[PDB]
Amino acid sequence: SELLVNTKSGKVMGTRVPVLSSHISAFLGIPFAEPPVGNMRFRRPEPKKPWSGVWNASTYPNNCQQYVDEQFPGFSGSEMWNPNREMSEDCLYLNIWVPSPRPKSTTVMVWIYGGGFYSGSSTLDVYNGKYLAYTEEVVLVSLSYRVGAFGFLALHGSQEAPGNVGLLDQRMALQWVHDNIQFFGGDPKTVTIFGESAGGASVGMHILSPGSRDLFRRAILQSGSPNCPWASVSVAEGRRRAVELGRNLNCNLNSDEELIHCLREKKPQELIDVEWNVLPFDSIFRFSFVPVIDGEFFPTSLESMLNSGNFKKTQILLGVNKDEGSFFLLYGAPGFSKDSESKISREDFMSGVKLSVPHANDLGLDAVTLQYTDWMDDNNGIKNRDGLDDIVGDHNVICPLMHFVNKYTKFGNGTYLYFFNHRASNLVWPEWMGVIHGYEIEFVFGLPLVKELNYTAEEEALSRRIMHYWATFAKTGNPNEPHSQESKWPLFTTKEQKFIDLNTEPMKVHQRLRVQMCVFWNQFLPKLLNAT
Amino acid sequence: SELLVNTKSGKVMGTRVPVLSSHISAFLGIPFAEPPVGNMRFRRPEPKKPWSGVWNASTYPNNCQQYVDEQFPGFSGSEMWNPNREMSEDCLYLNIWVPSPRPKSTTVMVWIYGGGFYSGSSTLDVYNGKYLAYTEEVVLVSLSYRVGAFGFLALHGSQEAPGNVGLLDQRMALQWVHDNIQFFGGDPKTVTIFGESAGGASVGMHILSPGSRDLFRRAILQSGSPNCPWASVSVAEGRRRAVELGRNLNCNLNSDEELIHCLREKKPQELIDVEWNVLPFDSIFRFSFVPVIDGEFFPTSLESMLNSGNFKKTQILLGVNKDEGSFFLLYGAPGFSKDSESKISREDFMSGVKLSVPHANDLGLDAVTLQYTDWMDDNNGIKNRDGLDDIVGDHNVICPLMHFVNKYTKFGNGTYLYFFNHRASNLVWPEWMGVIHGYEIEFVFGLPLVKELNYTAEEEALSRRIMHYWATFAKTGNPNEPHSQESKWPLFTTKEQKFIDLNTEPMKVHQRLRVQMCVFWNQFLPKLLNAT
Numbered sequence A, B: 001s002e003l004l005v006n007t008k009s010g011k012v013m014g015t016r017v018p019v020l021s022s023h024i025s026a027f028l029g030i031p032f033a034e035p036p037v038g039n040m041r042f043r044r045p046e047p048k049k050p051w052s053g054v055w056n057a058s059t060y061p062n063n064c065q066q067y068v069d070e071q072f073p074g075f076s077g078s079e080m081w082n083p084n085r086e087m088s089e090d091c092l093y094l095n096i097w098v099p100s101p102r103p104k105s106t107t108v109m110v111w112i113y114g115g116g117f118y119s120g121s122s123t124l125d126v127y128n129g130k131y132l133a134y135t136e137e138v139v140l141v142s143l144s145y146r147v148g149a150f151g152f153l154a155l156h157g158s159q160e161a162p163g164n165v166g167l168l169d170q171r172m173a174l175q176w177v178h179d180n181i182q183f184f185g186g187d188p189k190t191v192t193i194f195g196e197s198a199g200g201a202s203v204g205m206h207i208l209s210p211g212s213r214d215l216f217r218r219a220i221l222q223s224g225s226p227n228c229p230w231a232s233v234s235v236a237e238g239r240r241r242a243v244e245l246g247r248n249l250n251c252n253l254n255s256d257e258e259l260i261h262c263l264r265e266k267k268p269q270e271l272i273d274v275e276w277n278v279l280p281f282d283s284i285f286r287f288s289f290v291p292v293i294d295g296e297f298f299p300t301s302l303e304s305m306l307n308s309g310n311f312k313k314t315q316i317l318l319g320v321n322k323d324e325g326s327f328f329l330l331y332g333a334p335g336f337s338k339d340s341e342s343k344i345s346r347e348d349f350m351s352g353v354k355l356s357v358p359h360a361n362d363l364g365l366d367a368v369t370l371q372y373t374d375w376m377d378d379n380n381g382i383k384n385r386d387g388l389d390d391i392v393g394d395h396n397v398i399c400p401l402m403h404f405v406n407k408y409t410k411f412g413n414g415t416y417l418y419f420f421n422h423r424a425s426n427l428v429w430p431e432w433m434g435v436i437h438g439y440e441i442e443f444v445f446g447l448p449l450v451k452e453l454n455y456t457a458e459e460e461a462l463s464r465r466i467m468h469y470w471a472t473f474a475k476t477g478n479p480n481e482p483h484s485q486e487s488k489w490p491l492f493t494t495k496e497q498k499f500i501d502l503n504t505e506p507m508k509v510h511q512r513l514r515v516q517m518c519v520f521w522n523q524f525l526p527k528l529l530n531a532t
Ligand SMILES: COc1cc(CNC(=O)CCCCCNc2c3c(nc4cc(Cl)ccc24)C[C@H]2C=C(C)C[C@@H]3C2)ccc1O
Pocket: A069, A077, A078, A081, A082, A114, A115, A116, A119, A197, A198, A276, A327, A331, A332, A429, A436, A437, A438
């Protein structure tokens, strides 16, 4: 009854799940397209054909095929991001958490997982929607989408591997929500899409793309934006990386059809095993198969679209973490270790700069080095470590997002900007990594409300604050409740550029979120690289 | 007797002058070259032909022909630098102060005035040698040299106007000191040359030039160095400026001989009136007629001589003032005034950057602007004013000197570096100009010892503090007296790069003088300009 819902594609049967001291309804693993298997690998997706009978939606679905991290086997801090279900190309499913009793037409939030467009799962423990759905009385959806070559192999001109099909994956999920969430008590006119990392870039890409704009109301972007240097490639570079994938696998390279046909004959893991080999440079924070600027999903360049106001005009809430770079340095740069303070020698600093700005010429590398080096104290291993951390975070996350924020706000209908800088009391990663890429998510999804996870009382309060900000924004376009006695998160405006810190302390309002280095990253360095 | 001295060129009669509550001997206006007049204009100097009878050396000589500042008529702060004697091309004379009674063979210090190679006089009140000669028991010489076109018009390949003849004037005076100072109680083997601004650059040029090296023992450079961007031009640029001078005066331009013949017919003021017109850019801290890198006075480029160690190996003492740029902004840049705090708008800041780095392309100007702009507070008129002040001082004085210091110290036999940052209590210039280009000179020459000039007692001590450093360095190659236990001025070394502040407070040792900005000026910007 409460758990039996007839959708436009067929009947589904959910399950009743405990949440804190109560219960809510969960519909897990609902299919929203045809399995993209066999001759449909790399292809645009197709809607799921209606089914007879009742779809058992009591269990999480498979995860999409992806690279699996084995750097720290068994370590909870890294394994919490790996697939926790069987991987399969049959992975295009969504999950829904619905308050009990079912509401009539309440606000909908659709989570888009990140993972650099190469990884991610809707089923991770940290994305369990039940705490946010129960606490804030929202219908919480998490979608899925093909990652890696399966979602973003791009041979422009081919209709068999056109590129961006993972983005199209997200779109079909949003269209399914548009068509069916009313049967779960959700309001299809009040859908907020939100995501972190590539999910945040994705949210911004749907703001940009005409084919996506009418499928949601407003948007939240966490540590990601559509213009990030890692988040897209040209059609030429996408073509080069697809051909190099075939070269790594002894494919016929004479035509797209023969290349695609060879690649479609490979087992999924054969593609994954050579995925990182197609990158052009030794690099960190760079991923092989990402969205392409194609002229279809993206009509023109992202920058021209941002400049002209060619995007959805609505409210946005977005922000970054204090130490976005540390995860990438730990996994990919010399001198960093999970088990030490990772003081960085001058030599390893210079190596890290090269890995962090792989596209830069030697003059550009000199510019980055001078901007982030204290020449009164150039052998200070802690300053070198933190300087490289800032380089990676500023170049890859913060400065692209601030460029996006400033362009969007010229045309949009309300911007709210945050700086998340709380290090969790129970973090398993070392202190030099600070406030890590991905580690605001557990606060957004309410994990500190679970006493067994051993968060502090202040962290539970912070999680409750953030969930209420996110959900009140989703409901109203404004994270603040009116007539409330709590300090107000101010609008970000072109003139005053205000933002708040998010942490356990009373709110602080600041202005011009890191403005100096982003002048460097957004105006000076691109001009230097374009001149030289 | 004490005032009657037989030199190798003839007899001279000096005069007994009061100094504080005592007396010393002064020999003023001794000729060291033939008057460079008529056909001799622009020509290398020729030794003064010996005279019969007694040369009357009781009176200051004429000053060389030069541009005279009329910006602030009658204002003591600027008038103190103007010629205080009649100007004449018959101006190649030197002055000597000798302790009374005459010493046997004491240390000699030879002052070389500055003035951007376009101005300067040996006879200014602030260069009165009597306090230094009396207080420190040295023989103090001040020389003179042709400035402007008269000293530095350069038509390379012509022997009639070869360039660098003002430097050859200095050398001829040093040769005269070498040959004659023993008759005044000076030791020709212990001569220190010292100078400020262009005089400091000149001192460095004599260190470089093979034809000068044997005419002095060691060297002091104040707020100037041979590699300063204003201190030399190429033979091609000197030729362009000489031809343009002729163009301004309707000269025949078909040949060097015809051009020179024309310029020699003009009255001196006719040349001076158009002198600034030959500069290639709207600019500040750039001067028309300066030393040329000719392959004769300078055998190769300054940088290659410095890299190869092709220079005199001895001890040097040198330094800079806190606010070298302020004078040039007051006189040449928009928004500055003697009668206001000169808060600088953003627009006037950008204009000032362009005037300050006239040779830079737009990418270069962007780099300078980013390096000196606080983008959290870019409309702060005090920060804009002080940022421009630092740009002018760093680019033109401090960083070129630090480059020289660094290169010299690899091969030299002892470097002592200072940072003079005391603002005089009785300064007539406004507070925003800080510690001004030229305003350490009055301390070096002992003017705070004169009660009627109204320095504080701490400023008298500092002046005594500086005169003793300078004269002890001249005597021994080390500014510190041994077995004294005043705090010691450490050697500047390649590794530790120590320097001292010079001010009324107890001496503090620091390291790496303006190292951050000088990486920009000495390494990154030249690379950027070369590559773009
Ligand atoms: C040098 O060799 C390689 C090095 C690497 C480096 N990168 C990888 O292996 C991907 C590793 C995934 C790690 C798990 N995912 C994480 C994720 C996030 N944060 C993490 C923070 C820490 Cl401290 C650790 C892991 C995080 C946040 C999210 C964003 C991404 C890109 C992946 C996932 C979600 C890949 C391939 C190589 O061959």
